[PDB]
Scaffold this active site. Structure first.
Site, short mmCIF file in Angstrom:
data_model
loop_
_atom_site.label_atom_id
_atom_site.label_comp_id
_atom_site.label_asym_id
_atom_site.label_seq_id
_atom_site.Cartn_x
_atom_site.Cartn_y
_atom_site.Cartn_z
N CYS A 1 19.71 38.36 83.13
CA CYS A 1 19.25 38.42 81.74
C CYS A 1 18.91 39.86 81.39
O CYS A 1 18.70 40.69 82.29
CB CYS A 1 18.04 37.53 81.51
SG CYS A 1 16.55 38.01 82.40
N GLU B 1 22.15 34.66 88.69
CA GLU B 1 21.09 34.92 87.66
C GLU B 1 21.18 36.30 87.03
O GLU B 1 21.26 37.31 87.75
CB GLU B 1 19.68 34.80 88.26
CG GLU B 1 18.56 34.62 87.20
CD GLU B 1 17.17 34.87 87.76
OE1 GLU B 1 16.67 34.09 88.62
OE2 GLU B 1 16.57 35.87 87.33
N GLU C 1 15.47 35.00 95.20
CA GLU C 1 14.97 36.33 95.52
C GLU C 1 14.01 36.37 96.71
O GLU C 1 12.83 36.73 96.54
CB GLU C 1 14.32 36.98 94.27
CG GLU C 1 15.41 37.23 93.21
CD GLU C 1 14.97 38.00 91.98
OE1 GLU C 1 13.80 38.40 91.86
OE2 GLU C 1 15.86 38.21 91.13
#
Ligand SMILES: *[C@@H]1O[C@H](CO)[C@@H](O[C@@H]2O[C@H](CO)[C@@H](O[C@@H]3O[C@H](CO)[C@@H](O)[C@H](O)[C@@H]3O)[C@H](O)[C@H]2NC(C)=O)[C@H](O[C@@H]2O[C@@H](C)[C@@H](O)[C@@H](O)[C@@H]2O)[C@H]1NC(C)=O
EC number: 3.2.1.45
Length: 496
Positions: free
Chosen positions: A341, A339, A234
């Site tokens: 979640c 990634e 990021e």
């Protein structure tokens, strides 16, 4: 081995978890011609249950038809897995050794769901209990005091080895850094708004690129090699005032020039020259802009293998306008989801044990990603505690496995099974193929072909209504089935 069924437990949310401990965890056994296999999971509590059905020569009726187009060929799949953070490692290692083995087998074994990717943070992130890098001695431009601490050598590395030992499939490791040493940064802190000092091509950037080589050297000393690294986790985060977690800010032009002048050459001139470099590693709304900035520079483009994306702002970024457009412009640079979640927005409960909705969020993302050219999909923490931690900033989130340390118990959530409907049945080298529907419907579905030419179709029903359907494999036959409200199914058949 013998399959053992889920031990269901409800915690008052929309579905059950499966309860595992030192001596018990649910598992699989290790189709004939003219038959298909169906694996089904439902909110009511079926967990990857196997049944079988006939492939029929003919079909009549007005019902929904999904027709395979096996000659329309798209991307090849790299794979699926999750991240070995400090928090995941601490959680797993808090179990007794036999329970640890069952958790690792759940993920990595053929008796489990066949993960083949492990994302490894390069030193600390928010899912660590302390802040550190590998070179915290100030102004160590030579990196003489570069070293892996016990987080790597006692926790992450042994657990990665054990995962590899349990896997039949080759496992690919992917490294990503959150922060540099602070003495390389404008703001001198692990978080906050701050980038590398100076400019690409200079001593700070050459030192930071060397740090990646030192990392890969250190893991190689422990007999671990990497498939790929990303250029920064990021990068856009370190552009934002007060950003709370470890970060290091790059604009796309800054990342372009760092790759071109520093990171690309430094990796290419090392023993690690075969390690792939992925750019972005950030929200997909940044596409196609970031790909245009980096990849139209031929000095940068020669080092970039692929583009990594995170899911967190997908609501802002329709897949066609981001993933689809990036593929159209740069079809030879793979897209990879690195990634994801649930539970990470300030208003969300971190852990909802047994949440079916969170399972469906995973499978809907994975199907949407596959339909727009993405070659694989990586979960975040492999395991967390019931709070969604530990995490030094208390940025607690959810995980497909939740470890209850005082009970030597772990819980496999709906997310685990929704991921497994892909990871177990879509090996590396599988290829997405065409699939079209005869009428508007509320299903998410994707078709792929295995390296051996056999077919796999995953079907998620986003609605509460059961939907009868037929799958047509042209010149092979029809599968007559039904997709229950909320369910997820994987279908497999040999096309010979
Ligand atoms: C680890 O997890 C397993 C699976 O849940 C536990 O073993 C299971 O214990 C169940 C409940 O204690 C057993 O079911 C019972 O069976 C009888 C009928 O024969 C019923 O009267 C009763 O109401 C329950 O339904 C189940 O048989 C058993 N499963 C297996 C495959 O062994 C295990 O629990 C521990 O071991 C069992 C054998 C008992 O001694 C329990 O007291 C003990 O908790 C879990 N381990 C731990 C440490 O909890």
């Amino acid at each position: 081995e013998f399959a053992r069924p889920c031990i269901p437990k409800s915690f008052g949310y929309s579905s059950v978890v499966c309860v595992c401990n030192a001596t018990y965890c649910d598992s699989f056994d290790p189709p004939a011609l003219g038959t298909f296999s169906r694996y089904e999971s439902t909110r009511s509590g079926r967990r990857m249950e196997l049944s079988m059905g006939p492939i029929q020569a003919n079909h009549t009726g007005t019902g929904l038809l999904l027709t395979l187009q096996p000659e329309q060929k798209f991307q090849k799949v790299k794979g699926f897995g999750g991240a070995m953070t400090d928090a995941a490692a601490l959680n797993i290692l808090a179990l007794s050794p036999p329970a640890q083995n069952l958790l690792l087998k759940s993920y990595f074994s053929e008796e489990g769901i066949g993960y083949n990717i492990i994302r490894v943070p390069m030193a600390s992130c928010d899912f660590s209990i302390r802040t550190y890098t590998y070179a915290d001695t100030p102004d160590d431009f030579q990196l003489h005091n570069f070293s892996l601490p016990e987080e790597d050598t006692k926790l992450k590395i042994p657990l990665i080895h054990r995962a590899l030992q349990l896997a039949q499939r080759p496992v690919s490791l992917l490294a990503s850094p959150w922060t540099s040493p602070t003495w390389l940064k404008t703001n001198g802190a692990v978080n906050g708004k701050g980038s590398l000092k100076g400019q690409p091509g200079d001593i700070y950037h050459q030192t930071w690129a060397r740090y990646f080589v030192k990392f890969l050297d250190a893991y190689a000393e422990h007999k671990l090699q990497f498939w790929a690294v990303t250029a920064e986790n990021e990068p856009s985060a370190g552009l934002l005032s007060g950003y709370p977690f470890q970060c290091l800010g790059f604009t796309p032009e800054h990342q372009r020039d760092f790759i071109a002048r520093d990171l690309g050459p430094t990796l290419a001139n090392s023993t690690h020259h075969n390690v792939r470099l992925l750019m972005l590693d950030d929200q997909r709304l940044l596409l196609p802009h970031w790909a245009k900035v980096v990849l139209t520079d031929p000095e940068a483009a020669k080092y970039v293998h692929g583009i990594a994306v995170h899911w967190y702002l997908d609501f802002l970024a329709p897949a066609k306008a981001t993933l689809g457009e990036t593929h159209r412009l740069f079809p030879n640079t793979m897209l990879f989801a690195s990634e994801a979640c649930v539970g990470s927005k300030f208003w969300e409960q971190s852990v909802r044990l047994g949440s079916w909705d969170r399972g469906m969020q995973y499978s809907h993302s994975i199907i949407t990603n596959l339909l727009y050219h993405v070659v694989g999909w990586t979960d975040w923490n492999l395991a967390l505690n019931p709070e969604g931690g530990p995490n030094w900033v208390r940025n607690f989130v959810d995980s497909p496995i939740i470890v209850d340390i005082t009970k030597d118990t772990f819980y496999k959530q709906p997310m685990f099974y929704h991921l497994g409907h892909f990871s177990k049945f879509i090996p590396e080298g599988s290829q997405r193929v065409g699939l079209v529907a005869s009428q508007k419907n509320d299903l998410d579905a994707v078709a792929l072909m295995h390296p051996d030419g056999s077919a796999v179709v995953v079907v998620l029903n986003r609605s509460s209504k059961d939907v009868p359907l037929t799958i047509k494999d042209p010149a092979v036959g029809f599968l007559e089935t039904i997709s229950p409200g909320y369910s997820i199914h994987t279908y497999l058949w040999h096309r010979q």
